[PDB]
Each structure stands twice: as structure tokens, then as C-alpha cells.
Amino acid sequence: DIRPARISDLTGMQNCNLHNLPENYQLKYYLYHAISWPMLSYVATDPKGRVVGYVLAKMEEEPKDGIPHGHITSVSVMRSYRHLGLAKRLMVQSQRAMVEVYGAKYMSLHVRKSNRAAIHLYRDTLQFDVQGIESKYYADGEDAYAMHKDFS
Numbered sequence: 001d002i003r004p005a006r007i008s009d010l011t012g013m014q015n016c017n018l019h020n021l022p023e024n025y026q027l028k029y030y031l032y033h034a035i036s037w038p039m040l041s042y043v044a045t046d047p048k049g050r051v052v053g054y055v056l057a058k059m060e061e062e063p064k065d066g067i068p069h070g071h072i073t074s075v076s077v078m079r080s081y082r083h084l085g086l087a088k089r090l091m092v093q094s095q096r097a098m099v100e101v102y103g104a105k106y107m108s109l110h111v112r113k114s115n116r117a118a119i120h121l122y123r124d125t126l127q128f129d130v131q132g133i134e135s136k137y138y139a140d141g142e143d144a145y146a147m148h149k150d151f152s
């Protein structure tokens with residue numbers, strides 16, 4: 001059901017976002033970056049091989065002081081498969097690989113201010129802190145919450 005993401009998963013991934021299309025805006029870019037950090041990014045696949053959820057991530061390329069840290073760049077579970085703990089499961093596997101493989105000291109992400117489900121997922125169940133608002137972060141103008149999880 002869960003396996004590393006591949007370049008050929010792009011179409012399946014796009015199809016997870018049929019009812020929240022802004023998640024496709026940067027998907028290809030983030031997928032290319034994901035692939036260049038093996039073991040960080042995962043797809044969840046139904047009995048027919050169909051992608052029904054995914055997590056994309058990357059390590060910072062030129063970290064300050066050489067201190068490794070990670071970014072979750074996109075996570076999505078199609079509506080049919082939501083509320084099953086799939087996103088939780090994907091995020092945890094990505095987290096564990098960041099720490100165990102690349103020695104991440106922490107991880108960061110951005111989320112739209114209006115994305116109540118994702119904020120709850122990050123803040124309540126995965127215990128991220130909120131650093132603050134990054135004004136006009138998205139191409140369409142919306143602010144992002146900048147969020148962080150320390151692996152200390």
C-alpha cells in the first residue's frame with residue numbers, strides 16, 4: 001500500500017488533487033526535487049495500483065552551518081481516502097527517513113492560512129510549532145503559516 005514515490009507517479013498524484021487544484025501548482029517541481037532525495041517521499045496505492053495519497057519532501061540543499069534540515073513540500077490524500085490516518089502515516093514515514101537517513105535536526109513547511117484540516121494535522125496530531133505568518137507566500141496572494149518540528 002505504501003512505497004517510495006517515482007517520477008512516473010505525477011499523473012496519479014495530480015489526480016489526487018481534483019478538488020483542491022492549488023496543490024498541483026508546484027507539484028511537478030516538488031516531485032523532481034523529491035526524487036533527488038531518495039527515501040523521503042512516498043505514495044499510497046490502492047489495490048489497483050492507483051495513487052490515493054502522497055507525501056513529498058526534500059532536504060535543504062545548502063544548509064546554514066551545514067546543519068541538515070528537511071522540508072515537507074506537499075502532502076495530499078484524495079477525498080475518498082481521507083480520515084483514515086493516511087496523511088499521518090505518510091508524514092511519519094517521511095519524518096523518520098529525514099532523521100535516520102539524512103540526519104535532519106528539524107523540518108519545516110508552509111500551509112495556507114485557510115487550510116484548517118492541514119493546520120490541525122500538523123499542529124494537533126504531529127506537534128508542529130507555528131513560527132508565524134509569511135505574508136503573500138502563495139502565487140495567488142494568500143499568506144502561509146510557517147511551521148516547524150524540532151527533532152531535538
Ligand SMILES: CC(=O)SCCNC(=O)CCNC(=O)[C@H](O)C(C)(C)COP(=O)(O)OP(=O)(O)OC[C@H]1O[C@@H](n2cnc3c(N)ncnc32)[C@H](O)[C@@H]1OP(=O)(O)O
Binds near residue numbers: 075085111
Ligand atoms: C505542506 C503542505 O503540503 S500544505 C497542503 C496540505 N495538503 C492539502 O491541503 C491537500 C488537500 N487536503 C488533503 O489532502 C487532506 O485533507 C490532508 C492531507 C490535509 C489530511 O489527510 P487525511 O488522510 O484526511 O488526514 P489523517 O486521517 O491522516 O489525519 C487526521 C488528522 O488530521 C486532522 N484533520 C484532517 N481532516 C480534518 C478536517 N476536515 N478538519 C479538522 N481536522 C482535520 C486532525 O487533527 C486529525 O486527527 P483526528 O483523526 O484525531 O481528528
